[PDB]
Amino acid sequence: TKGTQAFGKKHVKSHTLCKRCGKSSFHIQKKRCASCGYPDAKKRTYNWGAKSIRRRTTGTGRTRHLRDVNARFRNGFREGTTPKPRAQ
Amino acid sequence: IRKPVTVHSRFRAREYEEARRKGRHTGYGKRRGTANARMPEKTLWIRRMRVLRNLLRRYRDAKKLDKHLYHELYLRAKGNNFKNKKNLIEYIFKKKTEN
Amino acid sequence: GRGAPLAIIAFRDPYKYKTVKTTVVAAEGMHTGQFIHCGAKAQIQIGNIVPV
Amino acid sequence: IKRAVHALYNVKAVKVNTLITPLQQKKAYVRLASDYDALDVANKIGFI
Amino acid sequence: SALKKSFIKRKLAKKQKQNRPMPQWVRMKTGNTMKYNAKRRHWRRTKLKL
Amino acid sequence: SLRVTYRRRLSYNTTSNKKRLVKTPGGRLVVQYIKKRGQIPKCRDTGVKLHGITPARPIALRLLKRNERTVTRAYGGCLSPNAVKERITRAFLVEEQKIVNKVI
RNA sequence: UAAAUAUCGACUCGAUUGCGAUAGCGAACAAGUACCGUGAGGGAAAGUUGCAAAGGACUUUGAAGAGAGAGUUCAAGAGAAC
RNA sequence: GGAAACUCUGGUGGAAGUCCGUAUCGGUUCUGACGUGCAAAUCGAUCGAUAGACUUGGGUAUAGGGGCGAAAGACUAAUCGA
RNA sequence: AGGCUCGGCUGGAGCUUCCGUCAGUGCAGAUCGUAAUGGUAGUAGCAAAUAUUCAAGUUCGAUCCUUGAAGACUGAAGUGGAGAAGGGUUCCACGUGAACAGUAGUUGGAUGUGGGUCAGUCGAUCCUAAGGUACUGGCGAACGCCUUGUAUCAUCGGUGGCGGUCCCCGCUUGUCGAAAGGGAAUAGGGUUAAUAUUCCCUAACUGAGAUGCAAAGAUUGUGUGCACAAGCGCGGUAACGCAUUCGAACUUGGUUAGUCGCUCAAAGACCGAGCUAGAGUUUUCUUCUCUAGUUAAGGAACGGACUCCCUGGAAUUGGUUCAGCCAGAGAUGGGGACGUUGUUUCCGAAAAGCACCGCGUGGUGUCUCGUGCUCUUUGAACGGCCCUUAAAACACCAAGGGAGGCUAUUAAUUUGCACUCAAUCGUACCGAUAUCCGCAUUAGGUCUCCAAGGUGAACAGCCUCUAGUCGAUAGAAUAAUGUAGGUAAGGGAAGUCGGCAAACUAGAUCCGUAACUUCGGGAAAAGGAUUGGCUCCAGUG
RNA sequence: ACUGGAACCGGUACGGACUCAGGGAAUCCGACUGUCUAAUUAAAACAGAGGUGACAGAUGGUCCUUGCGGACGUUGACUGUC
């Protein structure tokens, strides 16, 4: 009987947590993430999912290395040199 | 304190069993299962066969029966010719006198 | 799934120390402990495998 | 845990039991050999 | 379940840490607007879809 | 009466979960788990059971004394005495007939 | 094989006959957050004390919420959801 | 018992997609209860089956003009003539 | 007229005339969007799951929290005790004012603050099943797909000598996938507010190890301590037994395989007879009723159906099971061999646990028997069924083989003790009429284990013991209508589409049983008689 | 432990509660056990064993895949599907 009676039998998870995106969208039997495509080498993104792209695109995280590179570019990626030896 | 458990005596059951052994509470109005369910005819037959075979074995060991008469009586018992030990013993006695 | 019995037959490997087991549908009359001869020079006997 | 306890408090351990608490913290019970006194060692360390 | 995996346990531990009332002294900070932890979770009402 | 509970987390009456009820010195009725029983090996040629061989699980066979796995006879622990008798007779008679056929 | 050309997606800037919290980006605020769906995905509401917390000491009834006085304040009928 | 063929009687035995019936699985009738319900299908009595074409857990396989179907256009996450 | 000016009150920072020009420029409706609010209305309603009462405690405050007494219920296929999935702190302790617990609340799965999950032996970990997914190869505009297969394929590793190497032997194959399959090895008592096969005490076991100690190897025969010779064990006719008296590559095997039925045995549970110890009842009766009289893992010794061996030769055929069935292819008789389950006037071990009596830490006992178509579990041995025949891997063991190895007081080599170590992750609690899914503390759904007495065929129905509950908002009263039960004179389907609903029948023993029939059935056909209590009689080992 | 029998006794009654088919004569449909429209139709509907027919001897037949290739097939007419 579809409905309340049938909802009592739902105790086996079909999706679990994904190693790459941390979402509970990793299909156990298919061994693939329904969100980011893990373990596919490439990333799952579709142009019809504009909001999904916005959610999962760059800049929504920390961009630690990108910000570091932007900061270092401002002075020409200088390396091997230190500020002029001075004091207080 | 740990209180004592509530008493559940089997005294009435014991007196009922004594009366039943004397032969009470057993009439037709007290039976709810079939005769076979109360006492399987298979169990009764097993008991009878073990009794008769034991008697025949004892007699053959004691030399009161030869192999031929033992075989004849064994097959007759398996064929349900003797109602009980008394019947078998009487038959053996009569056959031995005739022989 | 098969209505015909199978015969497990053991042969000696001619080129190494080993026995080779063969599975084939039994012909009527074949029995355990029987000797089956397979080849061009085998005689006309039930169970033998020979050129037609 | 055995090696660290020995190197930090100069006490042998005859057994080490480890569990992880519901807050993902590793807790270790270290039973010292009969030679050493756990109460004295705790007094020396500070937690007492 | 009693028989669980270490990484599930780690996620549950972080959720346990997060589910906690806000410190009272934070309400005295300059420009503070928060009045309570607005992300409290009750085990029976809202469930972690792990 | 007293009732028992499983001591392990397996809660199904599988072949690996056979149990036995035992009374303990503390007056308790507890569950003791039954391990698999060893089987007497059979003849290679026939299927009859072999005598003089102590049964045990395959991993437990490594713990028995040497005499518990063998019989002082050719093919002992592998063939039955009747099988060995038949093999000896067959070998001797077949070789004798081979010699006779060679002579002829 | 450069230049004239395209493009604010990224970083950094200047403006406007645009909107003024149901408007303007979904998001002026712990917003792609809370929450929902197994999943693809869906997705809000929520700005305002006062110049300055000076955020109502103390007395009094009640177990308390709370109330009656009192005090702060240009002002509290601006008393915290202001 | 009979010339034989074979027949009769009493036991033993325990076969069957056999029967009554508990757990269990279904859902016939009351066209009962309820019908802004306990419940987006439940409740009571009465009923079908109950050692097999049986009932079931988990792991697996089949994905949309496709699957699966002892066949009702049935089911395919309260969604199915797409 | 669209609207406008001024006055009064509130409010606290912007607003405005006129000229041009521009527009996101005027609301009563669109089952319009969004936010808020009414009458209905203190109304519908808070009625399934038998049930509560008395006294006291705490509190400002008690139907609801706690204690005691009583009365009931689940009734062992539980409203009991534990787990798998799921939940994720809901577990335990101490505070609690508001919200929530559709009444209440001093209580709470709520709320604030703290505490809590200890493993060589329990699981994961390891093996593979159905199946998934890689390599090559092919296809494909491409992301990538298809095959898991002689398609592809130059896919290696094993003994030995030498000391990397040479001889020889073979021929090739990935990797995932089961806290219910396979699988190295732990039990008892105690301890906490909350952990227990994990902690403590006691007592074991498994695997990987080098080293040390002790004993073997390390003797026999002949001749006279000496000489010669002798290998790697003995006994039994046999089934096989006993010691540790070596051994590789390779090859071949062993390691319950389904389901149902019958019989037998062991343990646990149940039930009796005493004898102790404590309780209960005693107008009257009862040598009375109830409770406690327990023994773990691991060892030693015995025991073990079936099967096997020796003797011998069977018809006047015998042996034999509940049923089978077995024998000149060697029966009966007689005598032996083997072995899993298991048992003990035995260790563990009574120094434990249990029951009772005292003191402010002591003592006593914990014993003799029986019984069974009885149940559960385990084991043994058979039989029935299939056009159904009831896993695979790993790992260990055995046999054939005799390449090799040490050289009769040496050595190789086993044996036994002593010693070290055994990582990582889970471990709390619920598991459902309130910890899961159903919007929720929802009469729904959701996989399993343990299972007392009476009546009885019975795990049926009804009552009871251990354990657990009285949680379902309460009080008064008992109008109409209602839902659910119980009856009804005389008639007996006249009611109604229709005997819908209800009533009738029923257990067991004896007797009796038609048409028809596929000969199996119909059949419990139809239809009769008996059934209680008490005192006896007879039969069945 | 179960079976059969005898005397005596009461009372509205003796399977004293409880548990448990009313029976018979016919017609139509479907042989039977079984399955089905979860949430208005459990049936005369589907299945079924049995019967007949079709194709196929593998360089084959019936299907799937964009393609490569694959399933029946660990199959071979007493087989396979329709």
Curated annotation (Swiss-Prot), chain B:
- GO CC entries: cytosolic large ribosomal subunit
Q: Note whether Ribosomal protein occurs among the keywords.
A: yes
Q: Where is this region: Disordered?
A: 16-35
- Regions of compositional bias (Basic residues) in chain numbering: 21-33
- From the Swiss-Prot or TrEMBL record, what is one GO molecular function term? RNA binding
- Keyword terms: Ribonucleoprotein, Ribosomal protein
Protein name according to UniProt: Large ribosomal subunit protein eL19
Organism expressing this protein natively: Caenorhabditis elegans
From Swiss-Prot, chain C:
Q: Kindly list the places in or outside the cell where this protein is found, as annotated in its UniProt entry.
A: Cytoplasm
Family label: Belongs to the universal ribosomal protein uL2 family.
What protein am I looking at? Answer: Large ribosomal subunit protein uL2
Q: Which organism is it from?
A: Caenorhabditis elegans
What is the covered span of the full protein?
Answer: 53 to 104 of 260
Curated annotation (Swiss-Prot), chain D:
**UniProt similarity note:** Belongs to the universal ribosomal protein uL23 family.
- Main function: This protein binds to a specific region on the 26S rRNA.
Q: What name does the UniProt record give this protein?
A: Large ribosomal subunit protein uL23B
Q: Which organism is it from?
A: Caenorhabditis elegans
Swiss-Prot record, chain E:
Disulfide pairs? none
Biological process terms in GO annotation: translation
Matching InterPro entries: Ribosomal_eL39, Ribosomal_eL39_CS, Ribosomal_eL39_dom_sf
Matches recorded under PROSITE patterns: RIBOSOMAL_L39E
One MF term from GO for this chain? structural constituent of ribosome
- Per UniProt, which keywords does this protein have? Ribonucleoprotein, Ribosomal protein
Kindly give the PANTHER family that the UniProt entry links to this protein.
LARGE RIBOSOMAL SUBUNIT PROTEIN EL39 (PTHR19970:SF0), RIBOSOMAL PROTEIN L39E (PTHR19970)
Record's family? Belongs to the eukaryotic ribosomal protein eL39 family.
What protein is this chain from? Large ribosomal subunit protein eL39
This protein's species is Caenorhabditis elegans
